[PDB]
Amino acid sequence: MKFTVEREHLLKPLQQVSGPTLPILGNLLLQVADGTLSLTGTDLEMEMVARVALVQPHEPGATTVPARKFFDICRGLPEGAEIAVQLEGERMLVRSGRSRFSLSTLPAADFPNLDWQSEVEFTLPQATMKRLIEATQFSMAHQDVRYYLNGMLFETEGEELRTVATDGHRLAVCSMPIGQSLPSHSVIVPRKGVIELMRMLDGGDNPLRVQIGSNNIRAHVGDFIFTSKLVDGRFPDYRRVLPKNPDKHLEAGCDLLKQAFARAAILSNEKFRGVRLYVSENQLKITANNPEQEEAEEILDVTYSGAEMEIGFNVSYVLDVLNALKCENVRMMLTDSVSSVQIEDAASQSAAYVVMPMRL
Amino acid sequence: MKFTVEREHLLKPLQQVSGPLGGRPTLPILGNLLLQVADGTLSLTGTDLEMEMVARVALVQPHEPGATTVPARKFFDICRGLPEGAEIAVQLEGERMLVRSGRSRFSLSTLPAADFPNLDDWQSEVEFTLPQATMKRLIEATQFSMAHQDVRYYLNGMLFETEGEELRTVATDGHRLAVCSMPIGQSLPSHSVIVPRKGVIELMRMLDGGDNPLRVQIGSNNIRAHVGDFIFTSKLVDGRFPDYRRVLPKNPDKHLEAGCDLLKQAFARAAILSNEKFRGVRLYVSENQLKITANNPEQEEAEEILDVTYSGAEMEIGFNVSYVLDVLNALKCENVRMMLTDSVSSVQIEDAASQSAAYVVMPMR
Numbered sequence A: 001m002k003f004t005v006e007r008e009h010l011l012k013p014l015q016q017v018s019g020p021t022l023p024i025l026g027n028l029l030l031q032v033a034d035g036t037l038s039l040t041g042t043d044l045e046m047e048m049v050a051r052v053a054l055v056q057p058h059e060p061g062a063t064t065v066p067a068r069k070f071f072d073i074c075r076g077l078p079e080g081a082e083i084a085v086q087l088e089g090e091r092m093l094v095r096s097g098r099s100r101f102s103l104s105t106l107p108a109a110d111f112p113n114l115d116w117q118s119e120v121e122f123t124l125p126q127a128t129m130k131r132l133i134e135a136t137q138f139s140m141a142h143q144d145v146r147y148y149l150n151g152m153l154f155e156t157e158g159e160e161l162r163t164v165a166t167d168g169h170r171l172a173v174c175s176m177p178i179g180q181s182l183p184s185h186s187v188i189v190p191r192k193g194v195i196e197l198m199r200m201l202d203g204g205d206n207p208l209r210v211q212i213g214s215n216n217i218r219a220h221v222g223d224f225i226f227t228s229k230l231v232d233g234r235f236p237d238y239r240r241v242l243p244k245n246p247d248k249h250l251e252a253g254c255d256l257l258k259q260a261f262a263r264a265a266i267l268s269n270e271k272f273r274g275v276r277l278y279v280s281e282n283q284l285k286i287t288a289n290n291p292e293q294e295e296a297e298e299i300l301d302v303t304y305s306g307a308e309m310e311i312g313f314n315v316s317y318v319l320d321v322l323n324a325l326k327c328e329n330v331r332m333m334l335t336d337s338v339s340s341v342q343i344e345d346a347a348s349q350s351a352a353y354v355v356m357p358m359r360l
Numbered sequence B: 001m002k003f004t005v006e007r008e009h010l011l012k013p014l015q016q017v018s019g020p021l022g023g024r025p026t027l028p029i030l031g032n033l034l035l036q037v038a039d040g041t042l043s044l045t046g047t048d049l050e051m052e053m054v055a056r057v058a059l060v061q062p063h064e065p066g067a068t069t070v071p072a073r074k075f076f077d078i079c080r081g082l083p084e085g086a087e088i089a090v091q092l093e094g095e096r097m098l099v100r101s102g103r104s105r106f107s108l109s110t111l112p113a114a115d116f117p118n119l120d121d122w123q124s125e126v127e128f129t130l131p132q133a134t135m136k137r138l139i140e141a142t143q144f145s146m147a148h149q150d151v152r153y154y155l156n157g158m159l160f161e162t163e164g165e166e167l168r169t170v171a172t173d174g175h176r177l178a179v180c181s182m183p184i185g186q187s188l189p190s191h192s193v194i195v196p197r198k199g200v201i202e203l204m205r206m207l208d209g210g211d212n213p214l215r216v217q218i219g220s221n222n223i224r225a226h227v228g229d230f231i232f233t234s235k236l237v238d239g240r241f242p243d244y245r246r247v248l249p250k251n252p253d254k255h256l257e258a259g260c261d262l263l264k265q266a267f268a269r270a271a272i273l274s275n276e277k278f279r280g281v282r283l284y285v286s287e288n289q290l291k292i293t294a295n296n297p298e299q300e301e302a303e304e305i306l307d308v309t310y311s312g313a314e315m316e317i318g319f320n321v322s323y324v325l326d327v328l329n330a331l332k333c334e335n336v337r338m339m340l341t342d343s344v345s346s347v348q349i350e351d352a353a354s355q356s357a358a359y360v361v362m363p364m365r
């Protein structure tokens, strides 16, 4: 196995595959075949494959090498450098100018593979997939004993793709049109997979091709291919989480609401930061207090209809929403002091957020 | 005690005087700032018992004199959180201090000003002024060589030395040493004081970058620095610092000169295949050539060859590459000079263009 390639052509591929307990999982698979260098990183749950065209003389074959070391060496070389690689048994030689490196190797034969069959396929702009994941990702559970919440629902319905994420306390749902008639289907992508998929997306104009199997999801963009296993459980139905009949509607500036929440939060309990909301005619009052007897009060002029009520919220849950909205005005749709609240951009139905109240 | 101050006139003072704080304040009052309104000025003070940062804020709005202490981080965060241009009204009310701006209201618990720790008074024995740029140079040149929580406490600080028309800093952790001397333009008596690690950091933090020079005062047991409307004072570390003079190699006539960047990037790449713990690389110096190699237990190998200027006998010498990298990063120059002796002796490293900074790194087995 021998190739010579510009450092420049390796950098972004290396960045992506350095993404995805067993030493060989810390290695990259390198393969030269039919004029192409392929670089694969895996963690057994997901894999990223990148391809680089080889115009300079090259010899087929494969090996695996320490990924972080190989990446650091390449990154470390000067801009414009050319990188010549040759496999020498249990070592891979790397040369560029008067810099020389010998890396240990593990056999390509030992490198783990994920085969499976695609059941649902569609293409969409990167930008749309990025939008979907950013709108919802923060509501994924992290290390919940209900495994199926540690990730993100991808659902196809009609001509829309939809993401849903929830941790049982707050929920986020976003739908975007994809312009193709689609089968009704739902899968759960593990959180680490969501994160790696999002990192593959640079917001250039580039179609993303998605293929969903019973147990896997694959996304193709440019010369990269990402594959993850799916999470095997029963995701909650967002439709059953949306408040059935909110009778109280508050509209307020997103930024003013956010800043009042953030300031009030300073004098909330540091362990469990919550604030009390009091809604009344034309007005929202946010209050916090702490074990030191300190108190914050914010009063905001707001658009409001409904009965007066008091309701508490976890500060981070609301700030997370207001941060994901990045819009001028926000609508909060309330029911009562013991029920969850629906938050959305006042001027867009693309996404919705549901948040349980917090007792204070 | 009462004042009303525009947000942005209070914010950087609050940031600056919070410097010496934690984190985890050992006792509550050490997590507080002292606020004193007196003769048309708000003073803010934070302390950790070893040092204090004081800021003076002029009061253009109606105010009333008095003093209290309130939690620094909460007070800062409230002020930072208010919208730009916000007028921040403050009034002491016994056990609470009230903060109001627009329809934002906050109540903070106070501790009496009478109980705020207060660095004892002391006398200055030497005083000079110098550019902010010069002090930043002295500290950045040597800071990285200070020890980290060494049981030899004196090393966990930085030596400041005045001698003739020079101010000098020294730092070492016993393995490597950094010395930097800069002209002052006034003649100074001989003083040698150790500044505590956190004090060195605060000196750095307080150098804004404008035309305000720095006024320094040093006594037997304290140092003080004035910049703009800030006064930093620290207690000094009560120890005898090792002498840099007797640590500089005696006769390093083997003289190598190389491009700083080329040298740095070569050591950086070779470091990748150095032992993860010990970070050893080998240098083979030969006529106008440097060969850096690294290998680790798995017998991965890196080899960088560089053109350099060198005439002396060939030799082989081992260094912790992290130590070497720290020096090259702190030099920020075009060419470096390395002054060698033998494989079991320290190397002295300098900007090829200036003897103002010098670095001593001991070899590894």
Ligand SMILES: NC(=O)c1ccc(F)c(F)c1
Pocket: A166, A167, A168, A169, A170, A171, A236, A241, A340, A354, A355, A356
């Ligand atoms: N059943 C659920 O998973 C759920 C998720 C988020 C909520 F806010 C909620 F009220 C319920």
Ligand SMILES: [Ca+2]
Pocket: B006, B085, B086, B087
């Ligand atoms: Ca104003």
Ligand SMILES: [Ca+2]
Pocket: B179, B180, B181, B355, B356, B357, B358
């Ligand atoms: Ca000197």
Ligand SMILES: [Cl-]
Pocket: A009, A051, A052, A053
């Ligand atoms: Cl290519």
